[PDB]
């Protein structure tokens, strides 16, 4: 029952949670925490290339609303947690609380209270904690919330699309109007995996006009840092994306967020440089990208540490 602190990095399938500490040196420590005493639906999965005979399974009913529930409430927030059990194969199980003390909002209870997760069948008698999950579950069944609603719940299953029929047409049809999206993954600083709304397109988006240090089978200078810079700001965040262009299945675009433009930020931090092959498709003024990059180069920041000024 040791309360430890942390910061929500992302929400996983079955409502599992990855928690991190803050940068004290290099990469911040990560912790996958499964929620004890409850069972949430499984998200859609795409078969790994490692297992070629396996195939893509879809969403379980109310699995995606369950993920979205926690994503809206937990992402970027400070939480406290206690580990209840740790299986010999390394998997940790525990309780997650919103706040700084263990009497804050219990995440597991919040899920069950809204019919987004059910109680695990216990053979023994309920502890104090398992009893309230029962109350939350009955209140949810009475109110007919989520999985306790009338019907399949099949409308909560996304028609996930991992490819696009014609990328050029799909991008041009939006006429550079911002698209509601969720940043699901961060490959490196300037390339992300986005879930496009409202038809649930899972696409690869590269930032227009710039390029961050990348990995190739291995990391380049400031690659892991730049990835974290983008991750710590946009991972599983609600954003708007301007579909500016495309090369094959990869979509060139710009990510919009109330806290700022990640493209300008990356440049100003020296985590990225301007590239001329794609700078023409940047619709938010390419001259500002030049200024952001020039700002960093003058101060020899990160990738410009070994920059030699002309003389």
């Amino acid at each position: 029952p040791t309360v430890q602190r942390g910061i929500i990095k992302m929400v996983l399938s079955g409502c599992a949670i990855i928690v991190r500490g803050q940068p004290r040196g290099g990469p911040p420590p990560e912790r996958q925490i499964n929620l004890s005493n409850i069972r949430a639906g499984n998200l859609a999965r795409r078969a790994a290339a490692t297992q070629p005979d396996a195939k893509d399974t879809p969403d379980e009913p109310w699995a995606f609303p369950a993920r979205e529930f926690l994503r809206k409430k937990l992402i970027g927030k400070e939480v406290c947690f206690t580990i209840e059990n740790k299986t010999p194969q390394g998997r940790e199980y525990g309780m997650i609380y919103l706040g700084k003390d263990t009497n804050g909002e219990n995440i597991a209870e919040s899920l069950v209270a809204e019919g987004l997760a059910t109680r695990r069948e216990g053979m023994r008698a309920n502890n104090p904690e398992q009893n309230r999950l029962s109350e939350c579950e009955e209140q949810a069944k009475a109110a007919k919330k989520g999985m306790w609603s009338e019907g399949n719940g099949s409308h909560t299953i996304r028609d996930l699309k991992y490819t696009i029929e014609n990328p050029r047409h799909f991008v041009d049809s939006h006429h550079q109007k911002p698209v509601n999206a969720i940043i699901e993954h961060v490959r490196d600083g300037s390339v992300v995996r986005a879930l496009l709304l409202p038809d649930y397109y899972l696409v690869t988006v590269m930032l227009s006009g710039i390029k961050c240090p990348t990995f190739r089978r291995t990391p380049e200078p400031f690659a892991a840092e730049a990835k974290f810079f983008t991750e710590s700001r946009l991972l599983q965040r609600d954003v708007q994306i301007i579909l500016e262009s495309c090369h094959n299945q990869n979509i060139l675009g710009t990510i919009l967020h109330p806290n700022g433009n990640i493209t300008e930020l990356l440049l100003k931090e020296g985590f990225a440089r301007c590239v001329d092959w794609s700078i023409a498709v940047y619709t938010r003024g390419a001259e500002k990208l030049r200024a952001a990059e020039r700002f960093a180069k003058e101060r020899r920041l990160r990738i410009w540490r070994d920059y030699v000024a002309p003389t």
Binding site: I75, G76, E225, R302
Partner: peptide, 13 residues
Amino acid sequence: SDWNAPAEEWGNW
């Protein structure tokens, strides 16, 4: 200091 976590939180709310 090249591991820059944001001061202000970038939340969905």
